């Protein structure tokens, strides 16, 4: 890689973190996966997995972690010992909009009420502490045609530059 | 009746 241009390097790098971010979304469905932050160093890069069920992430002395370093090394063209992975816990789970989604998804898989789980995942946010939230579920449920309903309370601004970084969406 | 001029 002694002859690489910056523009195509960052283009392959942006899709590099996107490829792992999407893959770990598909992989750690039951581990409460939220996202990944990548630190790049010439010697040995490290990658952190943000999830709520970090104990299940390890499994058995990091069985899932060790098997993950092997597939990443084999697939992404990295040498032995060049990429190391760590597991972290979400500081404020309620304010991680991905978390309340993956709790709702498994509630839908279980068969919980549409309104009660929307208000339950809702009511969990102000007790953690938030200014506003809005969760919308649309589609078909034990019937014909697809219905969309929303559940929002509190100060909840959609329009403006502040909505770019103050709002996290899944 | 288009406001051309300025009873």
């Amino acid at each position: 890689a002694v002859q690489i241009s910056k523009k195509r390097k960052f283009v392959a790098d942006g899709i590099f973190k996107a490829e792992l971010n999407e893959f770990l979304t598909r992989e750690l469905a039951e581990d409460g996966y939220s996202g990944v932050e990548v630190r790049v160093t010439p010697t040995r890069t490290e990658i952190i997995i943000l999830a709520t069920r970090t104990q299940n992430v390890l499994g058995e002395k990091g069985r899932r972690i060790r098997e993950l370093t092997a597939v990443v090394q084999k697939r992404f063209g990295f040498p032995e010992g060049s990429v190391e992975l760590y597991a972290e816990k979400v500081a404020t789970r309620g304010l991680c909009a991905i978390a309340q989604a993956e709790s709702l998804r498994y509630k839908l898989l279980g068969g919980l009420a549409v309104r009660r789980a929307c208000y339950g995942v809702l009511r969990f946010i102000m007790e953690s502490g938030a200014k506003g939230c809005e969760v919308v579920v649309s589609g078909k449920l034990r019937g014909q045609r697809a219905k969309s309903m929303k559940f929002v309370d509190g100060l909840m601004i959609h329009s403006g530059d502040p909505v770019n970084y103050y709002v996290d969406t899944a | 009746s288009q406001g051309q001029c300025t009873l």
């Binding site: 195509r8 960052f10 283009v11 942006g14 899709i15 973190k17 996107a18 971010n21 999407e22 | -």
Partner: protein, 54 residues
């Protein structure tokens, strides 16, 4: 057999140029060789580095 199966030359082929997630042969983008559909980049643009400031 081996002289017929996939015997069509794979180089210089548009359809043979396919995105690495969607495997679609209509509307491929190759800027910086991105190998990414226009709509598939539509959804991952905030991930790669593209944000609609303008």
């Amino acid at each position: 057999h081996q002289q017929l199966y996939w015997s069509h030359p794979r180089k210089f082929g548009q359809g043979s140029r396919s995105c690495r997630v969607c495997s679609n042969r209509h509307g491929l983008i190759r800027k910086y060789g991105l190998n990414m559909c226009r709509q598939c980049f539509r959804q991952y643009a905030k991930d790669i580095g593209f944000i609609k400031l303008d």
